[PDB]
Each structure stands twice: as C-alpha cells, then as structure tokens.
Chain A
Amino acid sequence: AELTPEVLTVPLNSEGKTITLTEKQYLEGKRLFQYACASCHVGGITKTNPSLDLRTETLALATPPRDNIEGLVDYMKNPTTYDGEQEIAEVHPSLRSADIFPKMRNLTEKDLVAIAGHILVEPKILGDKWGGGKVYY
C-alpha cells in the first residue's frame, strides 16, 4: 500500500466538491495536529470527553457537518457543541481564543486546512483504530 492521491482526496465542502492534498500537506497536518491537538485527541479520541471522537461518521452527524475541510476549518475558528447550539471557544482552542490558547496564535489558514485534511485522511488509512481507543491499539 502507499499514500496515493485517491487516499489524499477528501470532501472540501458539504455540497460534494472534493480536493486532493499532496503528501506534503498531509505530513504537515500531522505535525501540526501533534503540535496543537494531540494532547487531547491522540489517535482520534478525546481524552477530556471520550464521548466525542474524530471519526468521520461522528463528524458527519455534527451540526453543522464537520466531515469536510471547510466544516473543520470553521470549527477551529469558532467551535460549537455537537448540536451547534453553543459556542465553546472559551474552553476549546480556536483562532477566536488564541489569546487564551496561545498555540493557535501562529497558525495560518493553510495550517488549519492541513490539520483538517489529516483528520479526514487518517481514518481512511487506519480504519477502526482512528477514534477507537485502546481496544484497537
């Protein structure tokens, strides 16, 4: 197996347009995901709320849908609860809260997109392992 562009092709938006990442953007999104998100999200779970993972099926049923680059980028700017009813920037890192979450300050729009791609590409590779927790280690 290898990292082909078919693997690196993920939904751009909810309307069905896709986008194909390069190997460079994938590795970039993984490095940045470790830098800013892995402390809570290692392997696709959420340490401080194990009820929400980063599985694409889960991201799909979020309000608004989060199984696409724009949906994820938007979450990293203005994150909400699973149902969209509340904004959680005060307790979740985002560009909106880069004063209280300093690791977000240096991030740029290209960075959030790489992180989003990594999240969307990773369960295509790892399968159940992404978001499955210790059972699949």
Chain B
Amino acid sequence: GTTGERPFSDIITSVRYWVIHSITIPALFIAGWLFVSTGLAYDVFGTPRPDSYYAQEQRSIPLVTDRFEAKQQVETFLEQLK
C-alpha cells in the first residue's frame, strides 16, 4: 500500500520541485567547489598541498613516532616546511 507520503514520481515531475532545486543543487555544488578552490579543505583537514609533503632537500617521511607527543610531533614537522 501507501505509507502516506507524497510519491517521488509526483515530486520530481512537479514544477515547484525544480523551482526550488534549480538553485539548491547548483548552489551546493558551487559551495563544495569553493571549499577546495579557496584552499580551505587543506587547512580544515591538514592535508598537504603538493608543495608541503617534503622539505626541499629531505626524502624522509614525517611519520609520527610517539603516542602522546604526536600532536607536538606533527606541528614540529610543519614548521620545517617554512
């Protein structure tokens, strides 16, 4: 039977549906695009940019080797990039 909600086939074909979503969908797409193009996703998650994996002359990986000094360890690695 029917649990009482409006049928999806009815909603997506409705004009009012697309009036609302001709904006929200492209707006959300643009918001995500901006999230990366501003470089903001690097800083929120601590992901290296292509230039910040190694120091200029090092080939060693900044692997964290301590449980409780780990947050301190990562920050020390980040300042040897400058």
Are B59 and A2 within 8 A (Cβ)?
A: no
Nearest-neighbor residue (CB-CB) of B56 within chain A = A1
| Interface range on chain A (Cβ under 8 Å from partner) | under 10
The interface on chain B, measured as residues whose beta carbon lies within 8 A of the other chain's beta carbons, has a size of 8
- Chain A contacts for B51, CB-based, 8 A: 1-2
Q: Does A18 contact B (CB under 8 A)?
A: no
Are B56 and A127 within 8 A (Cβ)?
A: no
**A residues 1-19 in Cβ contact with B at 8 Å:** 1-2, 4
**A residues 48-89 in Cβ contact with B at 8 Å:** none
- Chain A contacts for B77, CB-based, 8 A: none
Interface centre among A1, A2, A4, A127 (most CB of B within 10 A): A1
- Chain A contacts for B53, CB-based, 8 A: 1
Cα distance A1–B58 in the bound complex, in angstroms = 8
Are B56 and A4 within 8 A (Cβ)?
A: yes
Minimum Cβ distance to chain B for residue A68 (Å): 23
Minimum Cβ distance to chain B for residue A76 (Å): 30
B14-43 toward A: CB 8 Å interface, digit per residue (1/0)? 000000000000000000000000000000
Cα distance A1–B53 in the bound complex, in angstroms = 7
